[PDB]
C-alpha cells in the first residue's frame, strides 16, 4: 500500500539531496547564476543588482531557508533526469533494450530496414524545457540549462508562450521571441521536456507531438499527474504511436509520475503500437 509509496518517496529525496550536493560541488553554481553574474546589458546589470538586494535581504531575514522550497515531486523529476543521463546511464540501458527489440522485429521481418538516430555523449549542462512552469524550479539544479515558459508567467525569467502555438523550426539554436512572447523554437534541441502543466483530446495530443519534435534522439518527456488506471495503457499506446515509449512509471504517495523516451526509430515505436494495441484504444489522448 502507501507504505511502499512513502518508503520509495523518502529514498528518492535522499538520493536527490546527495546527488545535488555532489553536482553543486562540480559545477560551482547554477546556470542562472553564471548567466547573470556577467551582465552584457544594462537590463542584465539591473537584474544582477536587484538580485544582490534580494540576497542581502535573504541573508539578514530568516536563516536556513532559501525561499523557493522545491516540492517533492519535482525532486523526483530531477533525480530521474540525473540517473537517466549521468549517474545510471539509463539511456544506454534503454538503447540496448531497444536495439534488441529492433533486431527481433527485423528478425520476424515485421519491421523492414530502418534508419535511426542515437544521441551523442550527454553534455555537462542538460537542455530542459519546463512547459507551463511555475517559478522555473528546475533552474535550482546545477546541471540543468532550463527553458521555462508559461501561458501567464509571473516571473521575469519565464517566457510568455502558448505551447500549442509555437512553430518548432529546425536550424536555429535559440528560442525566437516576437513581441515579448515566443514565436519559434529550435527543433530537436532539448534533452528533456517537462509537462509541469498537466494535459487536461486533439490539443491533449498535439502538445506531445511538439514535445517529440523538440526532443533530441533518446530525450525524455516527464509528466506529473495527481491521483485526481487502465486509461494509462490505452494511451501509452497513443504515445507509443507518436514515437515515444514509457520508460518509467513511479507511484508517488498522491501523485503519479511518468517518463517517456523518444525512441531510436519512430518506425520502431509505431510498429510496437500495432503489436500492443488493445482492441478498444483510441488514436487520441483522453480523460
From Swiss-Prot:
One of its GO terms (molecular function) is amino acid sensor activity. It comes from Drosophila melanogaster (Fruit fly). Changing residue 163 to A: Abolished binding to S-adenosyl-L-homocysteine. Its EC number is 2.1.1.-. Keywords: Methyltransferase, S-adenosyl-L-methionine, Transferase. S-adenosyl-L-methionine binds at residues 73, 132, 150-151, 162-163, 196. One of its GO terms (biological process) is cellular response to methionine. Belongs to the BMT2/SAMTOR family. This is S-adenosylmethionine sensor upstream of mTORC1. Signal peptide: none annotated. S-adenosyl-L-methionine-binding protein. It is unclear whether this protein acts as a sensor of S-adenosyl-L-methionine to signal methionine sufficiency to mTORC1. Probably acts as a S-adenosyl-L-methionine-dependent methyltransferase. InterPro entries: Bmt2/SAMTOR (IPR021867), SAM-dependent_MTases_sf (IPR029063). S-adenosyl-L-homocysteine binds at residues 73, 132, 150, 162-163, 196. Disruption phenotype: RNAi-mediated knockdown in the whole organism is embryonic lethal. RNAi-mediated tissue specific knockdown in neuronal tissue, glial cells, motor neurons or muscle cells is embryonic lethal. RNAi-mediated tissue specific knockdown in midgut is viable but results in reduced adult lifespan. RNAi-mediated tissue specific knockdown in eye imaginal discs is viable but results in age-dependent eye dysmorphia with loss of cilia. RNAi-mediated tissue specific knockdown in wing imaginal discs is viable but results in severely deformed wings.
Amino acid at each position: 500500500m502507501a507504505t511502499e509509496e512513502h518508503q520509495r518517496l523518502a529514498s528518492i529525496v535522499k538520493s536527490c539531496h546527495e546527488s545535488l550536493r555532489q553536482l553543486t560541488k562540480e559545477y560551482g553554481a547554477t546556470a542562472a547564476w553564471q548567466e547573470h553574474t556577467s551582465p552584457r546589458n544594462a537590463k542584465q546589470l539591473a537584474e544582477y543588482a536587484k538580485a544582490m538586494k534580494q540576497l542581502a535581504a535573504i541573508w539578514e531575514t530568516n536563516d536556513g531557508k532559501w525561499p523557493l522550497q522545491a516540492r517533492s515531486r519535482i525532486k523526483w523529476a530531477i533525480d530521474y533526469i540525473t540517473k537517466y543521463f549521468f549517474t545510471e546511464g539509463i539511456y544506454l540501458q534503454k538503447r540496448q533494450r531497444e536495439q534488441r527489440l529492433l533486431e527481433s522485429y527485423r528478425a520476424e521481418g515485421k519491421l523492414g530496414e530502418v534508419q535511426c538516430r542515437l544521441m551523442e555523449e550527454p553534455p555537462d549542462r542538460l537542455h530542459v524545457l519546463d512547459v507551463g512552469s511555475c517559478f522555473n524550479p528546475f533552474s535550482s539544479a546545477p546541471h540543468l540549462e532550463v527553458t521555462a515558459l508559461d501561458l501567464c508567467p509571473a516571473t521575469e525569467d519565464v517566457l510568455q508562450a502558448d505551447f500549442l502555438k509555437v512553430e518548432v523550426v529546425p536550424g536555429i539554436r535559440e528560442p525566437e521571441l516576437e513581441e515579448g512572447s515566443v514565436r519559434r523554437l529550435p527543433a530537436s534541441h532539448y534533452e528533456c521536456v517537462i509537462f509541469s502543466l498537466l494535459l487536461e483530446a486533439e490539443q491533449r495530443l498535439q502538445c506531445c507531438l511538439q514535445a517529440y519534435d523538440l526532443l533530441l534522439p533518446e530525450g525524455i518527456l516527464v509528466l506529473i499527474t495527481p491521483d485526481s488506471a487502465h486509461l494509462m495503457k490505452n494511451w501509452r499506446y497513443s504515445l507509443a504511436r507518436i514515437g515515444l515509449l514509457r520508460v518509467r512509471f513511479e507511484k508517488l504517495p498522491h501523485i503519479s509520475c511518468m517518463v517517456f523516451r523518444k525512441a531510436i526509430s519512430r518506425e520502431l515505436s509505431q510498429h510496437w503500437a500495432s503489436i500492443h494495441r488493445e482492441e478498444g484504444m483510441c488514436e487520441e489522448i483522453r480523460i
